[PDB]
Structures are given as C-alpha cells and as structure tokens.
C-alpha cells in the first residue's frame, strides 16, 4: 500500500501544428490545508521534452530522480550520443511505462498520473499519458485527474480529430489552455491562482513560462444573488 | 324542541341556530367603517371604554394578523380572541408551507370553511 498524502491537481495539454502545450499549477495540498504554495510540477528533461506529473508529491520527486539520471546515463560515450541519438520523448515515456507496470505487480504503486509532452527528432508531435496502473493512450489532447471531466471537453472543441491539428496555430492554442485554467480555478478545490505553462515548438525549442496568473475573472453578477430560495 | 337547539334544519327549512348567532353580533354597540384608498386601506371603529377603572389601552378591536393583513372585529370579545388566534396560526402555517406571504383572499377563504 501507498496512500497519497500531499498531492497536486490536474495537468492539461494539447497538440497543435508546430508543437505541444502543457500546463499545470503549483499547489501541494495536504487534505483541506493548502500546505505548500509553489511546488513546480513540470520538469523539463532535456530541451524537447516536458514531463508533467500530478498526484502524490512524495513520488513526484522520486520520479524526478530517475529522470535526471536517465539524462546522465545517455551522456556517457561518444558525443554522437547527444547530437543525433539524443533522448527522444518516445524513449523517456517508455521508461516510465515499464517502471509503472512493475511497481503495481508488487502491489506497491507509484501513485501518479504522468503526461509526457514532446517533439521528436523526426518532426512529429508526441503526447502520451501513463498512470499508476500502467494504462497508456495518446490523443490530440490529454488531461489528468480532475481535469479529465472538466478541462478536456473544453479543449476537445478546438482540435477534435486528426485533421484539425495542422489548422490550429499557437495563438489559438495558448488561449485555449489559459482559458481552461480559468475554469479550473472556479470549479476545483485544490487549484490555485498561480500556474506554469510550457510551449514546445519545433522551430524555437522549449519556452518555459513560470507564474502566469489567471486574470479576467467574472464575479460582477454575484452581488445580485441573494437568499437560498424563499428568503426575500 | 331539539330542532332549534342544535344545527339541524327546522321543518320550515332554515338553520335557526345560525340565525340566532347574527343577533349576538350587535351586542357590543361598536360601529365600523372601512374604505379602499388608492394604494392603502383605512378602517375606523368606535372604542367605548365604559368604566373609569378600565385601562384604556388594552381595550382594542383591531388585531394585527401579519404585516400584510389587519383585522377589525365586530362582536363579543371572547370569540374575537378565539377567531384572531386561529387566524394568526393559519397566517404563519401558510408562509411555511408555500413560501410567500398569505394573500388577503386566502385568509378570508380559510375562515369561511372553518365557519361552515
């Protein structure tokens, strides 16, 4: 058994024509108490992969250790190792897939959902999801935990199928994500006003923007709602 | 004999006992007048305090049922208080089970049915 103690909430993502966007907030929650303000949950691995990890924090940090060592491993031996054999995303993902399956076969799970977002040396978009069971699936857009019921219906509008990907540009996608965060901050207990957001492009590399804040919050209507029904 | 004490019809076809109640009304010598304004209603009634000993404040014929409803009574005062107390209970109970204030008509129609 492992039960979660400290956790983070959702990770949300989507492809577009030149790369992928991935966002997740900075909150470690310990039950009701929002204990830790500012716990970065996107860890860039190399410069063409981000791995976003939600769920338990004790184990978020234990997968950060394996992912720092994998980079150190590959570096050994001929410089061709980091020139054109460097770690694709589709590798890094397969190492976490094989780790998660084995852990659950001892009945001792690493208690995390994971989204690996990257762009390969081939030029292709790669975006996949794995979790404490070892289930894996790839989609245009991916969400974890609570954002699977909420954020994903909003982002699936933009890019519904495979043919919409070469039409959606980075202006449309960056907005669609920042608009998802806005709905999660209304309608989720464990989220915060501060999130982080990453754009992986296949022409300008990794852009990592920290501490973007949700703005344009509508509460204007709220002063009219009064009583709980029969109250005058 | 026993057709004019209780409320059964007489051989003629009239509820004597009910008819006897209306003569019981004019046994206090109060007169009242009540007019509809344009956005209000006004009701005046005489208030005779017989003895010097009575405290003039307690003698009253105007009863506050709710914020919405006033009530002015003509007749003997024991039955006044008995009909005013039953009115207040119905006024509260209505509010509780339907969630708005009892209109005037609905309080009037509930009393006619208890009277029947």
UniProtKB/Swiss-Prot annotation, chain A:
GO terms for biological process: proteasomal ubiquitin-independent protein catabolic process; proteasome assembly; proteasome-mediated ubiquitin-dependent protein catabolic process. GO terms for cellular component: cytosol; nucleus; proteasome complex; proteasome core complex, beta-subunit complex; proteasome storage granule. It is found in: Cytoplasm; Nucleus. The keyword Cytoplasm applies. InterPro entries: Ntn_hydrolases_N, Proteasome_beta4, Proteasome_bsu_CS, Proteasome_sua/b, Proteasome_suB-type. Keywords: Cytoplasm, Nucleus, Proteasome. Belongs to the peptidase T1B family. Non-catalytic component of the proteasome which degrades poly-ubiquitinated proteins in the cytoplasm and in the nucleus. It is essential for the regulated turnover of proteins and for the removal of misfolded proteins. The proteasome is a multicatalytic proteinase complex that is characterized by its ability to cleave peptides with Arg, Phe, Tyr, Leu, and Glu adjacent to the leaving group at neutral or slightly basic pH. It has an ATP-dependent proteolytic activity. PRE3 and PRE4 are necessary for the peptidyl-glutamyl-peptide-hydrolyzing activity. The 26S proteasome consists of a 20S proteasome core and two 19S regulatory subunits. The 20S proteasome core is composed of 28 subunits that are arranged in four stacked rings, resulting in a barrel-shaped structure. The two end rings are each formed by seven alpha subunits, and the two central rings are each formed by seven beta subunits. The catalytic chamber with the active sites is on the inside of the barrel. Interacts with CIC1. Present with 16900 molecules/cell in log phase SD medium. This is Proteasome subunit beta type-7. The gene is PRE4.
From Swiss-Prot, chain B:
Disulfide bonds: none annotated. It comes from the Eukaryota. It is found in: Cytoplasm; Nucleus. The proteasome degrades poly-ubiquitinated proteins in the cytoplasm and in the nucleus. It is essential for the regulated turnover of proteins and for the removal of misfolded proteins. The proteasome is a multicatalytic proteinase complex that is characterized by its ability to cleave peptides with Arg, Phe, Tyr, Leu, and Glu adjacent to the leaving group at neutral or slightly basic pH. It has an ATP-dependent proteolytic activity. The 26S proteasome consists of a 20S proteasome core and two 19S regulatory subunits. The 20S proteasome core is composed of 28 subunits that are arranged in four stacked rings, resulting in a barrel-shaped structure. The two end rings are each formed by seven alpha subunits, and the two central rings are each formed by seven beta subunits. The catalytic chamber with the active sites is on the inside of the barrel. Interacts with CIC1. Present with 15200 molecules/cell in log phase SD medium. Belongs to the peptidase T1A family. This is Proteasome subunit alpha type-1. The chain holds residues 11 to 126 of 252 of the full protein.
């Amino acid at each position: 058994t492992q039960q979660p103690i400290v956790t983070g909430t959702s990770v949300i993502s989507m492809k577009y024509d030149n790369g992928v966007i991935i966002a997740a907030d900075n909150l470690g929650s310990y039950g009701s108490l929002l204990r830790f303000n500012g716990v970065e949950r996107l860890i860039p691995v190399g410069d063409n992969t981000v791995v976003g990890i939600s769920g338990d924090i004790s184990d978020m940090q234990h997968i950060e250790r394996l992912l720092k060592d994998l980079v150190t491993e590959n570096a050994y031996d001929n410089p061709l190792a980091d020139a054109e054999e460097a770690l694709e995303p589709s590798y890094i993902f397969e190492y976490l897939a094989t780790v998660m399956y084995q852990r659950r076969s001892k009945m001792n799970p690493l208690w995390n959902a994971i989204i690996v977002a990257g762009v390969q040396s081939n030029g292709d978009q790669f975006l996949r999801y794995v979790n404490l069971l070892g289930v894996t699936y790839s989609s245009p857009t991916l969400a974890t935990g609570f954002g699977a019921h909420m954020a994903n219906p909003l982002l699936r509008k933009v890019v519904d199928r495979e043919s919409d990907i070469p039409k959606t540009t980075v202006q449309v996608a960056e907005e669609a994500i920042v608009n998802a965060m806005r709905v999660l901050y209304y309608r989720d207990a464990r989220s915060s006003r501060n999130f982080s957001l990453a754009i992986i492009d296949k022409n300008t590399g990794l852009t990592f923007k920290k501490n973007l804040q949700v703005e344009n919050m509508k509460w204007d209507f709220a002063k009219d709602i009064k009583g709980y029904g029969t109250q005058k | 004999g026993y057709d004019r004490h209780i409320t059964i019809f007489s051989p003629e076809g009239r509820l004597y006992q009910v008819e006897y109640a209306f003569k019981a009304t004019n046994q206090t010598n109060i007169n009242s007048l009540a007019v509809r304004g344009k956005d209000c209603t006004v009701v005046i009634s005489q208030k005779k305090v017989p003895d010097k000993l009575l405290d003039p404040t307690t003698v009253s014929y105007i009863f506050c049922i709710s914020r919405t409803i006033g009530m002015v009574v003509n007749g003997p005062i024991p039955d006044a208080r008995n009909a005013a107390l039953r009115a207040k209970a119905e006024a509260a109970e209505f509010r509780y089970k339907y969630g708005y204030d009892m209109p005037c008509d609905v309080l009037a129609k509930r009393m006619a049915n208890l009277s029947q």
